[PDB]
């Protein structure tokens, strides 16, 4: 029974205990492998974090490293680079930024949560539900804005020609000209993809041109109905909330289950080398590093606490579930869920921006 | 004012080369791992107060440039990738970083590969790529250039291999090839398994022409036994470009950006205090983007690579040596038949 170490970089010591428990339960499930848990909390600065990945995690010969956030999100980057140096898989548990979907910079990175850009999957399904064929997409000119635009246009091109895109520089509080252009294009359904600070600026300028009321439908994601943006969001807006997106323990026990299942499916093969023992003197990659990454991404773990766990071609989580939230009288109301492939109605009625009220459709 | 130079073992160690006084620090090390890279730059930053780093490498690890980009955005130290894995272009430079490389983008390399085929009238070719990062940019630049040009090429549908280690799957995909010229895009570790599999199928003999970018050739001093004789590659690992000349270009870029920053601002940014234990107002970012040295354009793009890199077409002879057979670098044209 050889030991296989699993690394982790978690938020608190309380979560390290949960990480050790999940690996302990994974060992109960039963080649015989003894999984061992090795973890640290986040370091002060990124440099010390990278060094702690070498000295505390890679020095223990970890086959993978689970990464969440610190307490009070681009923090997994120092872990991604250092462990990606040897092609050691890095499973992100919290971050939803789209820069981690670029394998040219984060080749060895996976995620149990989907990036914000994959919210366009739900936008695409509501366009099929309501038979919407002309939408206006307003995105910020940044990595997250382009990724949301590209994912939406891909799903539409699988049938341009159905959406018009308007981009704005982040940090700009003067969206008057951009929004007047949206009006000139006969805008009815507007899809907004921006940060909390940027979405707030869009809403305030939208109320300027009387576009927060009747005659308009606002489809947004999670950041656009979070914090400051919610205070200025128009009544009747429809946003998304990733189910279990912020529950670190749920993704700790789900990632452990996927890694454990993938470790045993890996050792069924031949010519398997051990991960590097430390950083100093080791310059070549882990020989079976890329193979293990292909084994993880090909994994299918349907019995997951966060639903079915499959991974994108870029390592992003598939079959994630969202809550379709509709702002009614300054209060967010769940009018249905996207259960990974379809939309489920749930017995409430959507309140459109204004007075018109309707259900989560499925009918004329 | 204070610049450090880190290299690998070979002929080395003789130290030094406008208003600034340049104190060059020359150290050598055989270890190029994340901890060794961070420690050396931080130890170098903590003693000597360095304003810029010239780093050269002797490996195939593309992730060295990944670490130097990270170190440069955490210490605010301008770092120049000179040779080896430090100069391999993969990831875009971080916007806040000041890490630039003596390398060529994939679009610049495919420009050279198409000019080669146009000269030898190789209008028929196949495209063989893996799912390795960069392959979608590779296919796009080749499809658009072929469709936009008037050379009237014939291009087989792109053959894509999802997993290396494929065994039969690689063999099934390589059988779809029905062209004499083959453009292969994959990593150097992936090329070993693919070209060794293509040799068993009788596809690597002088009957065929395999053209690979610098990702496959990598370091010109490390040639795997699975690479076939007659392999054509476009790389920026010029053997004629000396390490002494490269570090001179590295020093020339930093000193020019230093005096230029000493003319617009009255001071040079002091080096950070320490890497451990606990931001600059102005950096040399805008001063080393465009810099000319000894009649050579050493400008960098915002993505990190050079605007006018020294591309070189190399061939692999039966003696298992790369032979410089062409040069693209002069006046935007490929001069072959060397």
């Amino acid at each position, epitope marked *: 029974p050889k030991i296989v170490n699993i690394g982790a970089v978690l938020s608190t010591k309380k979560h390290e*205990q949960i990480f050790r428990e999940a690996v302990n339960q994974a060992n109960k499930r039963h080649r015989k492998i003894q999984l061992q848990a090795t973890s640290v909390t986040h370091r002060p600065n990124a440099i010390q974090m990278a060094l*702690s990945v070498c*000295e505390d995690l890679i020095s223990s010969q970890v086959y993978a490293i689970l990464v969440s956030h610190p307490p009070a999100h681009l923090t997994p980057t120092p872990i991604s680079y250092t462990a990606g140096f040897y092609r050691i898989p890095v499973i992100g548990l919290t971050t939803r930024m789209s820069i981690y979907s670029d394998k040219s910079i984060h080749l060895s990175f996976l995620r149990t949560v989907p990036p914000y850009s994959h919210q366009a999957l739900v936008w695409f399904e509501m366009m099929r539900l309501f038979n919407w064929n002309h939408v206006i997409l307003i995105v910020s000119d940044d990595h997250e804005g382009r990724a949301a635009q590209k994912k939406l246009e891909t799903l539409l091109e699988g049938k341009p020609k159905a959406d018009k895109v308007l981009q704005f520089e982040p940090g700009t509080k003067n969206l008057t000209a951009l929004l007047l252009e949206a009006k000139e294009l006969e805008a009815r359904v507007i899809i907004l993809s921006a940060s909390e600070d940027d979405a707030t600026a869009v809403y305030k300028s939208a109320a300027m041109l009387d576009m927060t009321g009747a005659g308009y439908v606002w489809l947004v994601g999670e950041r656009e109905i979070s914090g400051s943006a919610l205070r200025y969001a128009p009544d009747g807006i429809i946003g998304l909330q990733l189910i279990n997106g912020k529950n670190e323990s749920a993704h700790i026990s789900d990632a452990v289950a996927v890694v454990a299942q993938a470790i045993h499916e890996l050792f069924e093969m031949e010519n398997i080398t051990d991960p590097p023992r430390g950083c100093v003197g080791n310059t070549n990659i882990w020989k079976t590093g890329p193979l293990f990454k292909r084994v993880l991404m090909s994994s299918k773990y349907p019995d997951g606490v966060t639903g079915r766990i499959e991974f994108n071609e870029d390592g992003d989580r598939k079959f994630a579930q969202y809550s379709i939230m509709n702002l009614q009288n300054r209060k967010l109301v769940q009018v249905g869920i996207f259960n990974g492939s379809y939309i489920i109605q749930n017995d409430r009625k959507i309140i459109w921006p204004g007075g018109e009220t309707e259900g989560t459709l499925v009918p004329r | 004012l204070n610049i450090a130079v880190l290299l690998g073992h070979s002929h080395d160690v003789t130290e030094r080369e406008l208003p600034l006084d340049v104190n060059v620090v020359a150290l050598l090390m055989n270890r190029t791992d994340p901890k060794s890279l961070i420690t050396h730059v931080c130890d170098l930053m903590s003693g000597a107060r360095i304003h810029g780093l010239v780093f050269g490498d002797d490996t195939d690890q593309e992730a060295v440039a990944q670490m130097l980009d990270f170190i440069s955005s955490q210490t605010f130290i301008p770092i120049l990738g000179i040779h080896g894995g430090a100069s391999m272009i993969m990831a875009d430079k971080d916007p806040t970083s000041t890490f630039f490389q003596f390398g060529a983008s994939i679009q610049q390399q495919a420009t050279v590969m198409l000019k080669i085929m146009q000269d030898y009238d190789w209008h028929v070719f196949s495209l063989v790529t893996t799912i390795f990062p960069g392959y979608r940019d590779f296919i796009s630049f080749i499809k658009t250039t072929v469709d936009n040009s008037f050379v009237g090429w014939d291009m087989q549908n792109v053959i894509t291999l999802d997993t290396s280690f494929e065994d039969a799957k690689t063999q099934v995909q390589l059988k779809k090839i029905h062209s004499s010229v083959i453009l292969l895009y994959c990593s150097k570790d992936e090329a070993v398994l693919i070209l060794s599999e293509a040799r068993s199928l009788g596809l690597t003999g002088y009957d065929f022409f395999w053209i690979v970018p610098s990702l496959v050739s990598g370091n010109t001093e490390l040639i795997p036994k699975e690479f076939p004789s007659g392999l054509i590659s476009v790389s920026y690992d010029d053997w004629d470009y000396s390490l002494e000349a490269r570090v001179r270009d590295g020093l020339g870029i930093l000193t020019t950006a230093a005096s230029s920053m000493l003319e617009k601002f009255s001071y040079i940014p002091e080096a950070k205090a320490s890497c451990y*234990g606990q931001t600059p107002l102005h950096t040399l970012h805008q001063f080393m983007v465009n810099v000319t040295w000894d009649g050579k354009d050493l400008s960098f793009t915002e993505e990190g690579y050079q605007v006018h890199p020294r591309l070189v077409v190399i061939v692999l002879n039966k003696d298992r040596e790369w032979e410089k057979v062409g040069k693209w670098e002069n006046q935007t044209l490929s001069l072959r038949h060397a």
Partner: antibody, heavy 119, light 100 residues
Framework: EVKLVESGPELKKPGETVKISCKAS????????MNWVKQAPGKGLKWMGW????????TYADDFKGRFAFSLETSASTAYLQINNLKNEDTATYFC????????????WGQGTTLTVSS | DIVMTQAPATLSVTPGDRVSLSCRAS??????LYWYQQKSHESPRLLLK?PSRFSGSGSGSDFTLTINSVEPEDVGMYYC?????????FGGGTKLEIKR
């Protein structure tokens, strides 16, 4: 590689002050904590306290408050243990142990410093 | 505070047998329970996080360190440390002797 070398043995009369050094090597200082453990001759292991190395914040135990001060250099990678008003009950071997994470287990110990408070 | 009480002070094991040393805590400390080995005239050495012949089991308030195949080099003192709350306390120690 990773080592902890403490200062040599000391001999002090009752009522003086001594400073024990703990020089660390082979790892990133300010990434761990330093624990100080006391062991009387053949009389078990007793915990004195620890000090965060990133933030020089000491944490003394109840039995070792008042006459014990934790200190460090961070440039020489050295942790210090100073004991004032020496009594006869202080004659013991004093180990420094690195705290994994901070507040984790003690994964690396020094060789120990033998202190003798006799007249 | 919290006192760590180790069940057998001394043990004499035949080379190759399997010995289990116990460590009971007054209060529950979850899994923050470490094991140290101190050979004669040496500093303590960390054994178990929460070798290759040493294994750890137990949780809550009662734990156990087991040596599957005892080796002659295993002679010495074995302490268990509470690392769950301040102040951290050690056990009374277990002296391991080997039959011969």
């Amino acid at each position: 590689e990773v080592k902890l070398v403490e200062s040599g043995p000391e001999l002090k009369k009752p009522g003086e002050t001594v400073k024990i050094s703990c020089k660390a090597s082979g790892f990133t200082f300010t990434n761990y904590g330093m624990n100080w453990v006391k062991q009387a001759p053949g009389k078990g292991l007793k915990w004195m306290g620890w000090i965060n190395i990133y933030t020089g914040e000491p944490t003394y135990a109840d039995d070792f408050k008042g006459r014990f001060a934790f200190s460090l250099e961070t440039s020489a990678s050295t942790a210090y243990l100073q004991i004032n008003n020496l009594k006869n009950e202080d004659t013991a071997t004093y180990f420094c142990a690195r705290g994994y994470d901070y507040e984790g287990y003690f994964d690396y110990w020094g060789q120990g410093t033998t202190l003798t408070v006799s007249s | 505070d919290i006192v760590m009480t180790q069940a057998p002070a001394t043990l004499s094991v035949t080379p190759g047998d399997r010995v289990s040393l116990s460590c009971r805590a007054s209060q529950s400390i979850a899994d923050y329970l470490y094991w140290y080995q101190q050979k004669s005239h040496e500093s303590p050495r960390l054994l178990l996080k929460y070798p290759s012949r040493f294994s750890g089991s137990g949780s809550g308030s009662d734990f156990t360190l087991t040596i599957n195949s005892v080796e002659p080099e295993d002679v010495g003192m074995y302490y268990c440390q509470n690392g769950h709350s301040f102040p951290r306390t050690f056990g009374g120690g277990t002296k391991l002797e080997i039959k011969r």
